[PDB]
Amino acid sequence: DVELRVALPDGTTVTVRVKKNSTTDQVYQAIAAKVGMDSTTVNYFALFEVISHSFVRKLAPNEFPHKLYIQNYTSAVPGTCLTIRKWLFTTEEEILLNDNDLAVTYFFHQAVDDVKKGYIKAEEKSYQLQKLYEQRKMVMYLNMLRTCEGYNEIIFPHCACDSRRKGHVITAISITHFKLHACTEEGQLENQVIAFEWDEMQRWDTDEEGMAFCFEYARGEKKPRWVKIFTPYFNYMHECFERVFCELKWRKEEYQEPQDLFA
């Protein structure tokens, strides 16, 4: 048995004892039980690894959280490199949890932090959000922030792309689109953005050897094209695609027979 520490959205840390070779899902479930999640909330959060002050990476199911915890332990210092964050692209489903105290509290504290890191641009509504924040009117704060650009959008660090000769791309993933932002090889934005609709996606895959996430898209009646994004986080990006399409299909599900044409 070994100790593991994991940061929570409210800034507190939880300690759990796990088997050394526990996988992501086993560790996540142990944390969820300890913090009091139930069947109504456990599926909206996940384990992430803090990569930088501006990026966290979702652990894939075959990873071992203790291996990562101890690898970064000295670098992590007082804090840990493991953290629980929301895993949800469909903001509409988030609103339906506004009567769930644990969900609201976690969503709230993460949102406050995501505004401070510039992920969510709240400048237009800053005055009312500050008033709601100071009154700890969490639901009202979240309902307003949910209208702001960047809410529930995952931004990846800049990286090379086989479909741009010179320069990098910054990948931005939300339930509404998959976006690529042009930037320089040193991360400097170049004021150009391409948006892909999710229903334009045909196939996607990883290339472990080539360190790439790959997707095939087709706009209108044109032939499909593959794009390679040379991100170190290709497994995470792949899991974002899987999650988005999972959430889109769940939404559809929530809202002579066709199964035999012949009588």
XYZ file of N, CA and C in Angstrom, residues 29-258:
690
model
N -12.166 6.411 -8.349
C -13.336 5.960 -7.606
C -13.107 6.020 -6.105
N -11.881 5.746 -5.664
C -11.558 5.850 -4.247
C -11.654 7.290 -3.768
N -11.190 8.240 -4.582
C -11.313 9.647 -4.212
C -12.779 10.068 -4.186
N -13.548 9.634 -5.181
C -14.954 10.020 -5.252
C -15.707 9.570 -4.009
N -15.483 8.325 -3.580
C -16.099 7.847 -2.346
C -15.678 8.695 -1.151
N -14.382 9.010 -1.047
C -13.890 9.746 0.116
C -14.477 11.152 0.197
N -14.695 11.808 -0.945
C -15.169 13.188 -0.889
C -16.685 13.269 -0.899
N -17.381 12.142 -1.037
C -18.823 12.143 -0.932
C -19.587 12.301 -2.223
N -18.968 12.038 -3.365
C -19.733 11.962 -4.600
C -20.671 10.757 -4.573
N -21.766 10.851 -5.326
C -22.592 9.669 -5.528
C -22.829 9.436 -7.007
N -23.760 8.529 -7.321
C -24.018 8.195 -8.709
C -24.438 9.406 -9.518
N -24.956 10.455 -8.869
C -25.396 11.639 -9.599
C -24.256 12.582 -9.958
N -23.101 12.487 -9.286
C -21.991 13.397 -9.550
C -20.716 12.709 -10.014
N -20.523 11.425 -9.694
C -19.235 10.775 -9.937
C -18.856 10.822 -11.409
N -19.838 10.861 -12.308
C -19.523 10.804 -13.727
C -19.249 12.167 -14.335
N -19.193 13.237 -13.535
C -18.886 14.552 -14.085
C -17.482 15.053 -13.748
N -16.631 14.217 -13.164
C -15.289 14.638 -12.755
C -14.312 13.548 -13.157
N -13.010 13.861 -13.084
C -11.992 12.891 -13.461
C -10.661 13.323 -12.868
N -9.697 12.420 -12.942
C -8.319 12.691 -12.519
C -7.515 13.340 -13.636
N -6.768 14.395 -13.293
C -5.867 15.089 -14.213
C -4.484 15.213 -13.585
N -3.491 15.437 -14.440
C -2.124 15.716 -14.026
C -1.805 17.162 -14.372
N -1.338 17.925 -13.385
C -0.928 19.308 -13.632
C 0.369 19.292 -14.428
N 0.323 19.808 -15.652
C 1.520 19.870 -16.490
C 2.264 21.177 -16.287
N 1.520 22.271 -16.279
C 2.069 23.604 -16.116
C 1.047 24.417 -15.348
N 1.371 25.682 -15.099
C 0.365 26.538 -14.490
C -0.782 26.856 -15.436
N -0.657 26.527 -16.721
C -1.726 26.791 -17.672
C -2.248 25.533 -18.364
N -1.872 24.336 -17.920
C -2.405 23.155 -18.590
C -2.417 21.962 -17.651
N -3.562 21.291 -17.598
C -3.677 19.994 -16.946
C -4.089 18.978 -17.997
N -3.633 17.750 -17.802
C -3.786 16.669 -18.763
C -4.583 15.547 -18.102
N -5.622 15.071 -18.774
C -6.438 13.999 -18.215
C -5.672 12.685 -18.263
N -5.682 11.947 -17.154
C -5.071 10.621 -17.137
C -5.884 9.638 -17.967
N -5.195 8.907 -18.841
C -5.819 7.847 -19.608
C -6.119 6.661 -18.691
N -7.046 5.779 -19.086
C -7.441 4.687 -18.177
C -6.317 3.725 -17.808
N -5.301 3.552 -18.654
C -4.248 2.584 -18.366
C -3.102 3.186 -17.557
N -3.229 4.429 -17.107
C -2.142 5.016 -16.348
C -2.220 4.603 -14.882
N -1.097 4.791 -14.176
C -0.972 4.477 -12.754
C -0.762 5.765 -11.970
N -1.794 6.305 -11.305
C -1.634 7.623 -10.675
C -0.491 7.685 -9.688
N -0.189 6.597 -8.976
C 0.948 6.657 -8.064
C 2.272 6.837 -8.806
N 2.422 6.207 -9.966
C 3.687 6.371 -10.727
C 3.884 7.858 -11.037
N 2.822 8.536 -11.459
C 2.929 9.969 -11.766
C 3.098 10.815 -10.510
N 2.389 10.471 -9.439
C 2.496 11.229 -8.191
C 3.928 11.222 -7.674
N 4.559 10.053 -7.680
C 5.887 9.974 -7.098
C 6.942 10.516 -8.067
N 6.689 10.418 -9.370
C 7.658 10.943 -10.366
C 7.782 12.461 -10.218
N 6.662 13.147 -9.994
C 6.654 14.594 -9.884
C 6.647 15.065 -8.438
N 6.768 14.143 -7.480
C 6.606 14.495 -6.073
C 7.527 15.641 -5.670
N 8.828 15.485 -5.929
C 9.808 16.533 -5.529
C 9.503 17.859 -6.238
N 9.156 17.802 -7.526
C 8.804 19.016 -8.310
C 7.515 19.640 -7.762
N 6.574 18.783 -7.352
C 5.251 19.165 -6.802
C 5.396 19.907 -5.466
N 6.447 19.584 -4.699
C 6.771 20.226 -3.385
C 5.599 20.034 -2.413
N 5.072 21.098 -1.766
C 3.972 20.978 -0.800
C 2.701 20.443 -1.473
N 2.457 20.888 -2.709
C 1.299 20.478 -3.530
C 1.532 19.152 -4.238
N 0.517 18.649 -4.941
C 0.643 17.379 -5.701
C 0.393 17.656 -7.187
N 0.881 16.783 -8.072
C 0.619 16.947 -9.495
C -0.711 16.336 -9.922
N -1.454 15.719 -9.005
C -2.735 15.100 -9.325
C -3.860 16.005 -8.865
N -4.914 16.098 -9.673
C -5.995 17.017 -9.350
C -7.304 16.504 -9.941
N -8.402 16.755 -9.230
C -9.742 16.399 -9.700
C -10.342 17.621 -10.376
N -10.787 17.470 -11.622
C -11.464 18.570 -12.287
C -12.720 18.052 -12.966
N -13.583 18.988 -13.330
C -14.792 18.645 -14.065
C -14.429 18.028 -15.413
N -15.231 17.059 -15.848
C -15.071 16.401 -17.144
C -16.446 16.431 -17.789
N -16.731 17.522 -18.509
C -18.071 17.752 -19.044
C -18.011 18.876 -20.067
N -18.427 18.602 -21.299
C -18.422 19.637 -22.316
C -19.780 20.292 -22.483
N -20.857 19.575 -22.170
C -22.216 20.057 -22.441
C -22.690 20.905 -21.268
N -22.610 22.221 -21.428
C -22.963 23.123 -20.337
C -24.402 22.939 -19.882
N -25.279 22.602 -20.824
C -26.721 22.415 -20.530
C -26.891 21.330 -19.458
N -26.108 20.249 -19.520
C -26.184 19.189 -18.513
C -25.639 19.656 -17.171
N -24.701 20.602 -17.196
C -24.186 21.176 -15.962
C -25.275 21.926 -15.209
N -26.128 22.644 -15.939
C -27.161 23.440 -15.294
C -28.128 22.555 -14.535
N -28.399 21.361 -15.052
C -29.337 20.458 -14.398
C -28.848 19.988 -13.035
N -27.572 20.189 -12.720
C -27.029 19.870 -11.408
C -27.041 21.061 -10.457
N -27.750 22.151 -10.790
C -27.727 23.337 -9.940
C -28.337 23.099 -8.568
N -29.035 21.981 -8.361
C -29.577 21.645 -7.052
C -28.707 20.644 -6.306
N -27.508 20.371 -6.801
C -26.621 19.394 -6.185
C -25.480 20.161 -5.514
N -25.452 20.142 -4.180
C -24.528 21.007 -3.450
C -23.077 20.694 -3.790
N -22.708 19.409 -3.807
C -21.326 19.050 -4.117
C -20.956 19.481 -5.528
N -21.820 19.197 -6.505
C -21.521 19.582 -7.885
C -21.333 21.090 -8.007
N -22.285 21.864 -7.473
C -22.205 23.320 -7.563
C -20.915 23.825 -6.925
N -20.597 23.330 -5.731
C -19.403 23.807 -5.036
C -18.147 23.547 -5.856
N -18.019 22.335 -6.409
C -16.837 22.029 -7.208
C -16.820 22.847 -8.486
N -17.967 22.924 -9.176
C -18.015 23.701 -10.415
C -17.654 25.149 -10.140
N -18.176 25.686 -9.032
C -17.947 27.074 -8.667
C -16.463 27.360 -8.453
N -15.818 26.587 -7.583
C -14.422 26.885 -7.259
C -13.526 26.691 -8.470
N -13.820 25.688 -9.308
C -13.027 25.528 -10.523
C -13.238 26.707 -11.469
N -14.493 27.145 -11.624
C -14.783 28.291 -12.483
C -14.009 29.531 -12.039
N -14.058 29.846 -10.737
C -13.330 30.998 -10.206
C -11.862 30.899 -10.576
N -11.292 29.704 -10.444
C -9.886 29.538 -10.794
C -9.672 29.647 -12.299
N -10.607 29.128 -13.100
C -10.440 29.176 -14.544
C -10.551 30.604 -15.072
N -11.353 31.455 -14.432
C -11.365 32.871 -14.807
C -10.010 33.511 -14.512
N -9.464 33.258 -13.317
C -8.177 33.837 -12.934
C -7.056 33.415 -13.875
N -7.116 32.204 -14.425
C -6.087 31.755 -15.356
C -6.346 32.216 -16.781
N -7.394 33.006 -17.009
C -7.704 33.509 -18.330
C -8.401 32.538 -19.262
N -8.742 31.325 -18.797
C -9.454 30.367 -19.647
C -10.831 30.888 -20.046
N -11.530 31.536 -19.120
C -12.884 32.035 -19.339
C -12.818 33.554 -19.328
N -13.286 34.178 -20.401
C -13.185 35.623 -20.563
C -14.485 36.252 -20.070
N -14.418 36.857 -18.888
C -15.591 37.390 -18.215
C -15.563 38.908 -18.097
N -14.791 39.592 -18.950
C -14.577 41.027 -18.757
C -15.888 41.800 -18.845
N -16.718 41.486 -19.840
C -17.975 42.208 -20.024
C -18.869 42.123 -18.784
N -18.932 40.953 -18.151
C -19.797 40.708 -17.003
C -19.044 40.755 -15.682
N -17.829 41.304 -15.686
C -16.968 41.232 -14.513
C -17.628 41.841 -13.276
N -18.373 42.944 -13.444
C -18.939 43.630 -12.280
C -19.961 42.751 -11.570
N -20.900 42.170 -12.317
C -21.908 41.330 -11.679
C -21.307 40.031 -11.151
N -20.337 39.456 -11.868
C -19.692 38.232 -11.390
C -18.956 38.468 -10.081
N -18.287 39.616 -9.954
C -17.620 39.924 -8.695
C -18.634 40.036 -7.561
N -19.782 40.674 -7.814
C -20.787 40.789 -6.761
C -21.353 39.425 -6.384
N -21.644 38.585 -7.375
C -22.107 37.237 -7.075
C -21.035 36.427 -6.360
N -19.773 36.589 -6.766
C -18.694 35.849 -6.118
C -18.590 36.217 -4.642
N -18.563 37.514 -4.343
C -18.376 37.925 -2.956
C -19.565 37.535 -2.082
N -20.762 37.420 -2.659
C -21.897 36.941 -1.880
C -21.984 35.424 -1.836
N -21.039 34.718 -2.455
C -21.093 33.260 -2.561
C -22.453 32.792 -3.082
N -23.019 33.548 -4.027
C -24.201 33.095 -4.759
C -23.700 32.222 -5.903
N -23.394 30.962 -5.565
C -22.657 30.086 -6.477
C -23.460 29.771 -7.735
N -24.707 29.329 -7.574
C -25.531 29.028 -8.747
C -25.628 30.245 -9.669
N -25.978 31.409 -9.119
C -26.127 32.590 -9.972
C -24.803 32.968 -10.623
N -23.701 32.862 -9.873
C -22.385 33.105 -10.451
C -22.128 32.180 -11.637
N -22.386 30.876 -11.461
C -22.134 29.908 -12.532
C -23.048 30.147 -13.733
N -24.333 30.420 -13.483
C -25.256 30.671 -14.591
C -24.790 31.841 -15.447
N -24.244 32.887 -14.820
C -23.736 34.017 -15.591
C -22.427 33.669 -16.302
N -21.486 33.055 -15.589
C -20.227 32.694 -16.225
C -20.450 31.740 -17.393
N -21.490 30.895 -17.319
C -21.764 29.939 -18.384
C -22.074 30.611 -19.717
N -22.361 31.912 -19.723
C -22.590 32.663 -20.956
C -21.306 33.230 -21.549
N -20.178 33.071 -20.871
C -18.942 33.729 -21.261
C -18.118 32.844 -22.187
N -17.392 33.483 -23.101
C -16.576 32.729 -24.041
C -15.507 31.952 -23.291
N -15.269 30.717 -23.734
C -14.286 29.858 -23.111
C -14.829 28.922 -22.056
N -16.063 29.123 -21.591
C -16.628 28.189 -20.624
C -16.689 26.800 -21.244
N -16.160 25.808 -20.517
C -16.169 24.400 -20.936
C -15.455 24.204 -22.272
N -14.325 24.871 -22.423
C -13.479 24.732 -23.593
C -12.089 24.324 -23.119
N -11.552 23.248 -23.688
C -10.210 22.773 -23.349
C -9.217 23.361 -24.346
N -8.195 24.047 -23.837
C -7.128 24.627 -24.653
C -5.852 23.812 -24.465
N -5.229 23.385 -25.611
C -3.964 22.657 -25.508
C -2.778 23.582 -25.769
N -1.589 23.250 -25.253
C -0.398 24.040 -25.593
C -0.103 23.974 -27.090
N 0.570 25.006 -27.591
C 0.832 25.100 -29.021
C 1.763 23.979 -29.463
N 1.588 23.522 -30.702
C 2.428 22.441 -31.196
C 2.380 22.409 -32.724
N 3.307 21.648 -33.297
C 3.388 21.512 -34.746
C 2.177 20.764 -35.293
N 1.965 20.922 -36.599
C 0.815 20.359 -37.293
C 1.226 20.057 -38.725
N 0.929 18.842 -39.202
C 1.342 18.469 -40.556
C 0.592 19.236 -41.637
N -0.433 19.991 -41.265
C -1.225 20.766 -42.210
C -0.971 22.263 -42.060
N 0.223 22.622 -41.593
C 0.701 23.997 -41.683
C 2.207 23.962 -41.886
N 2.672 24.592 -42.970
C 4.079 24.504 -43.345
C 4.974 25.197 -42.322
N 4.605 26.406 -41.904
C 5.402 27.173 -40.952
C 4.474 27.708 -39.875
N 4.749 27.356 -38.634
C 3.947 27.783 -37.504
C 3.249 26.623 -36.821
N 2.732 26.919 -35.636
C 2.094 25.962 -34.749
C 0.588 26.211 -34.698
N -0.122 25.329 -33.991
C -1.549 25.518 -33.751
C -1.821 25.373 -32.263
N -2.817 26.112 -31.790
C -3.362 25.944 -30.450
C -4.748 25.322 -30.582
N -4.919 24.125 -30.030
C -6.174 23.396 -30.182
C -7.156 23.798 -29.088
N -8.397 24.094 -29.487
C -9.466 24.485 -28.567
C -10.682 23.590 -28.804
N -11.090 22.830 -27.783
C -12.140 21.822 -27.919
C -13.331 22.194 -27.036
N -14.503 22.302 -27.646
C -15.736 22.548 -26.917
C -16.840 21.703 -27.535
N -17.994 21.665 -26.862
C -19.117 20.927 -27.417
C -19.602 21.544 -28.729
N -19.334 22.832 -28.964
C -19.891 23.475 -30.154
C -18.999 23.265 -31.376
N -17.673 23.333 -31.216
C -16.759 23.088 -32.333
C -15.418 22.579 -31.837
N -14.619 22.144 -32.805
C -13.201 21.863 -32.653
C -12.471 22.961 -33.413
N -11.630 23.728 -32.720
C -10.997 24.902 -33.315
C -9.479 24.796 -33.279
N -8.837 25.298 -34.331
C -7.384 25.397 -34.389
C -7.014 26.864 -34.548
N -6.233 27.383 -33.602
C -5.762 28.764 -33.609
C -4.324 28.797 -34.110
N -4.080 29.583 -35.157
C -2.732 29.741 -35.682
C -1.849 30.508 -34.704
N -0.611 30.049 -34.549
C 0.353 30.778 -33.741
C 1.751 30.472 -34.255
N 2.719 31.248 -33.770
C 4.094 31.051 -34.184
C 4.666 29.804 -33.522
N 5.860 29.419 -33.970
C 6.557 28.299 -33.354
C 6.872 28.540 -31.881
N 6.793 29.782 -31.401
C 7.020 30.077 -29.992
C 5.732 30.408 -29.248
N 4.571 30.068 -29.815
C 3.302 30.210 -29.122
C 2.591 31.536 -29.304
N 3.138 32.437 -30.116
C 2.587 33.775 -30.311
C 1.402 33.715 -31.265
N 0.235 34.151 -30.801
C -0.974 34.068 -31.616
C -0.846 34.917 -32.877
N -1.471 34.445 -33.960
C -1.391 35.105 -35.260
C -2.746 35.574 -35.780
N -3.735 35.669 -34.891
C -5.083 36.207 -35.224
C -5.751 35.487 -36.404
N -5.698 34.158 -36.419
C -6.380 33.344 -37.420
C -6.888 32.074 -36.757
N -8.144 31.719 -37.024
C -8.769 30.555 -36.404
C -9.568 29.785 -37.450
N -9.442 28.459 -37.414
C -10.224 27.541 -38.236
C -11.153 26.773 -37.310
N -12.420 26.654 -37.691
C -13.384 25.930 -36.875
C -13.888 24.724 -37.649
N -13.920 23.573 -36.985
C -14.454 22.343 -37.548
C -15.709 21.961 -36.787
N -16.780 21.684 -37.523
C -17.996 21.176 -36.921
C -17.827 19.701 -36.588
N -18.441 19.291 -35.483
C -18.286 17.908 -35.064
C -18.897 16.951 -36.067
N -19.978 17.351 -36.748
C -20.553 16.467 -37.757
C -19.732 16.423 -39.038
N -18.665 17.224 -39.142
C -17.708 17.078 -40.232
C -16.644 16.027 -39.943
N -16.542 15.555 -38.702
C -15.533 14.567 -38.340
C -15.944 13.192 -38.842
N -15.047 12.548 -39.585
C -15.277 11.205 -40.098
C -14.590 10.144 -39.253
N -13.302 10.326 -38.980
C -12.513 9.360 -38.233
C -11.496 10.122 -37.400
N -10.971 9.453 -36.373
C -9.876 10.001 -35.590
C -9.119 8.843 -34.958
N -7.880 9.128 -34.566
C -6.915 8.093 -34.207
C -5.690 8.768 -33.603
N -4.874 7.977 -32.913
C -3.570 8.434 -32.456
C -2.473 7.726 -33.234
N -1.305 8.366 -33.267
C -0.087 7.809 -33.846
C 0.965 7.894 -32.745
N 1.076 6.835 -31.941
C 2.004 6.862 -30.812
C 3.436 7.082 -31.280
N 3.880 6.296 -32.267
C 5.241 6.432 -32.782
C 5.520 7.860 -33.243
N 4.602 8.444 -34.019
C 4.772 9.798 -34.506
C 4.374 10.905 -33.553
N 3.919 10.570 -32.345
C 3.488 11.557 -31.352
C 2.470 12.524 -31.964
N 1.340 11.968 -32.404
C 0.351 12.783 -33.095
C -1.057 12.318 -32.756
N -1.972 13.285 -32.725
C -3.403 13.030 -32.783
C -3.861 13.337 -34.197
N -4.671 12.449 -34.760
C -5.068 12.531 -36.159
C -6.584 12.529 -36.264
N -7.122 13.425 -37.085
C -8.547 13.410 -37.359
C -8.771 13.606 -38.849
N -9.841 12.998 -39.338
C -10.232 13.101 -40.733
C -11.564 13.829 -40.796
N -11.618 14.902 -41.579
C -12.823 15.709 -41.690
C -13.240 15.819 -43.151
N -14.500 16.195 -43.360
C -15.026 16.406 -44.706
C -16.070 17.511 -44.632
N -15.789 18.631 -45.300
C -16.729 19.780 -45.323
C -17.591 19.679 -46.583
N -18.913 19.747 -46.428
C -19.806 19.683 -47.596
C -19.623 18.401 -48.389
N -19.395 18.539 -49.698
C -19.258 17.403 -50.649
C -17.788 17.119 -50.981
N -16.842 17.788 -50.316
C -15.392 17.607 -50.616
C -14.866 16.270 -50.074
N -13.699 15.829 -50.560
C -13.136 14.565 -50.113
C -12.573 14.709 -48.700
N -12.691 13.679 -47.858
C -12.101 13.743 -46.517
C -10.596 13.990 -46.547
N -10.120 14.716 -45.532
C -8.706 15.019 -45.348
C -8.287 14.661 -43.928
N -7.110 14.044 -43.797
C -6.486 13.791 -42.505
C -5.611 14.971 -42.105
N -5.651 15.311 -40.816
C -4.804 16.330 -40.204
C -4.070 15.686 -39.039
N -2.770 15.943 -38.930
C -1.972 15.423 -37.826
C -1.573 16.583 -36.924
N -1.908 16.478 -35.647
C -1.526 17.472 -34.655
C -0.471 16.836 -33.764
N 0.745 17.373 -33.812
C 1.880 16.755 -33.132
C 1.921 17.232 -31.682
N 0.899 16.815 -30.942
C 0.884 17.194 -29.539
C 1.374 16.039 -28.681
N 2.183 16.310 -27.652
C 2.495 15.253 -26.676
C 1.258 14.671 -26.021
N 0.143 15.397 -26.024
C -1.065 14.970 -25.330
C -2.064 14.338 -26.285
N -1.575 13.528 -27.236
C -2.458 12.976 -28.255
C -3.513 12.063 -27.654
N -3.174 11.317 -26.593
C -4.172 10.463 -25.950
C -5.276 11.284 -25.295
N -4.911 12.388 -24.648
C -5.911 13.277 -24.065
C -6.814 13.864 -25.141
N -6.222 14.372 -26.221
C -7.020 14.918 -27.313
C -7.972 13.869 -27.880
N -7.483 12.639 -28.063
C -8.355 11.553 -28.498
C -9.524 11.370 -27.536
N -9.245 11.372 -26.225
C -10.314 11.188 -25.249
C -11.304 12.348 -25.263
N -10.846 13.557 -25.593
C -11.779 14.667 -25.796
C -12.747 14.396 -26.946
N -12.249 13.877 -28.078
C -13.154 13.525 -29.174
C -14.168 12.484 -28.723
N -13.692 11.408 -28.094
C -14.596 10.362 -27.633
C -15.650 10.929 -26.683
N -15.233 11.785 -25.746
C -16.178 12.339 -24.782
C -17.218 13.234 -25.461
N -16.779 14.120 -26.366
C -17.703 15.003 -27.078
C -18.761 14.191 -27.813
N -18.337 13.176 -28.578
C -19.314 12.396 -29.333
C -20.200 11.575 -28.405
N -19.634 11.079 -27.307
C -20.441 10.441 -26.275
C -21.528 11.382 -25.753
N -21.160 12.636 -25.458
C -22.123 13.577 -24.888
C -23.163 13.991 -25.922
N -22.751 14.162 -27.182
C -23.721 14.483 -28.225
C -24.753 13.376 -28.373
N -24.311 12.113 -28.348
C -25.251 11.012 -28.534
C -26.134 10.818 -27.305
N -25.576 11.009 -26.114
C -26.390 10.993 -24.899
C -27.506 12.025 -24.966
N -27.188 13.208 -25.492
C -28.200 14.289 -25.606
C -29.339 13.801 -26.502
N -29.012 13.296 -27.694
C -30.034 12.777 -28.596
C -30.879 11.707 -27.922
N -30.236 10.790 -27.196
C -30.966 9.724 -26.522
C -31.966 10.278 -25.521
N -31.548 11.289 -24.755
C -32.397 11.873 -23.682
C -33.688 12.471 -24.250
N -33.685 12.886 -25.516
C -34.900 13.513 -26.097
C -35.504 12.619 -27.188
N -46.496 -0.015 -39.670
C -45.355 -0.924 -39.655
C -44.144 -0.265 -39.006
N -43.449 -1.020 -38.159
C -42.314 -0.473 -37.437
C -41.166 -0.171 -38.398
N -40.288 0.773 -38.040
C -39.089 1.003 -38.862
C -38.147 -0.189 -38.898
